[PDB]
Design a protein around this ligand. Structure first.
Ligand SMILES: [Mn+2]
Ligand SMILES: [Mn+2]
Lengths: 263, 264
């Protein structure tokens, strides 16, 4: 039995309590919340968790400035915002925040082809951000989940092994890996083997099918990967992150979850 | 049952055309997919190398400045003139056709800037006009245009085999066929084998790489299952390496991947 959560989707109710109710009745085990929605509505979120029993598992997004941002002022402002998100997560019982090195800032694979910063420059800035967030995570009892993205979305961290290097070489104790099936389907040599080899640091999982749409609408072998997580005694959640391609979005979402329950 | 397996050029290949053809043949490949500009500027050298080695030019790819769906009209039109010259060169050396996407590296809906400067209907009109024009050249020269869907990050216009099929069917084109690329398909298709099957009437060419764009066998793509689908569908084209190499010894990894691929 896997614990299966979801991020927000546009067809979810806007009202926080109704949103939690709606997510619960679809069958999900948890909610991965936007960081700014969480910080700006802490008490509403706490109430909704209490009334529904649907927990906030994690936060994702909600800050302006990547931990590996090219612009130093933006990186530092982002760290201040991520600190607030971690504080809010502790107040509602969330486990941690999902962050990539960056999104949509640069890629080696599309023009402009030349990075404005050296590889050592990338590593120093990401490492410094993670060292700072390690201090906040220790204070708040939370974790930073470091997410490799595919090569088009980020140049710095593309594989689980990339994230592992940052964690191990900085000897971080409050930064874990989050593997995303969609990005892994592009970047990993062997998805199940990557989950296994990193079971010591894999703290969170994102799921979507190979084309980023609802699980089951593509051909990712969710049953095989779930079996790998079971064999490794995976403790965390698997959380929907991605898009919906369907005439009836809500029905396709429910059907995907029902199908995942048989994996 | 055995497949015809070719390759594009790689940086470690010899630069001299005759040596390059010799080298590719010796690694065991069945054909060469040549850069369009290399071909056009060296037709006689290429003809000599085909004759001496027996290694055919199967197709061309690249070699023109201006996408068939280019945002800039002058670039689109200049590209068509260059693609025409490439199709003429292919006819002279016995190649079958040219591989083109709608565009590469021009725009994507999935990365900033998020808003396209052109409407969807504008995209369709420009790509369709380009394909009509090339259809005329293909009819004259006895060649084919292989229309390649790319993944959503490389191109906004044509991402699935069904996208390319639309363009071909709704324009009633007879000299434009689909080229499926395993790497792009692994991102975009609902079901890769099914997509190859449902489009077997228009699938004229195939690009192969593993899921992370590196040499076949270094990732997780089930090449045996996909080659079986092609065989079941009576596919008679080539499967051509397009992609990158990650290895300490690139030449050896290239040989090893092809040797392994011969068992699929
Ligand atoms: Mn993710
Ligand atoms: Mn290709």
């Amino acid at each position: 039995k896997m614990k299966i959560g979801t991020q927000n989707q546009a067809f979810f109710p806007e009202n926080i309590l109704e949103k939690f109710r709606y997510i619960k009745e679809m069958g999900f085990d948890g909610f991965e919340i936007d960081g700014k929605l969480l910080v700006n509505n802490i008490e509403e979120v706490k109430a909704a968790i209490k009334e529904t029993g649907l927990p906030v598992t994690t936060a994702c997004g909600g800050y302006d400035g990547w931990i590996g941002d090219f612009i130093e002022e933006r990186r530092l402002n982002g760290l201040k915002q991520i600190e607030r998100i971690l504080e809010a997560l502790a107040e509602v019982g969330g486990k941690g925040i999902v962050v990539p090195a960056a999104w949509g800032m640069f890629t080696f694979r599309l023009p402009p082809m030349t990075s404005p910063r050296s590889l050592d420059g990338d590593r120093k800035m990401v490492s410094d951000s993670l060292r700072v967030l390690e201090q906040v995570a220790a204070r708040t009892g939370t974790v930073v989940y470091l997410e490799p993205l595919n090569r088009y979305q980020d140049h710095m961290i593309n594989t689980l092994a990339d994230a592992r290097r940052y964690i191990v070489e900085n000897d971080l104790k409050h930064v874990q890996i989050i593997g995303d099936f969609y990005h892994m389907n592009i970047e990993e040599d062997n998805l199940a083997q990557a989950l296994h080899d990193n079971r010591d640091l894999l703290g969170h999982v994102h799921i979507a099918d190979n084309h980023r749409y609802q699980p089951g609408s593509g051909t990712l072998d969710f049953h095989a990967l779930f079996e790998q997580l079971r064999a490794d005694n995976y403790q965390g959640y698997v959380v929907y992150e991605g898009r919906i391609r369907a005439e009836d979005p809500a029905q396709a979402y429910r059907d995907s979850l029902a199908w995942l329950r048989t994996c």
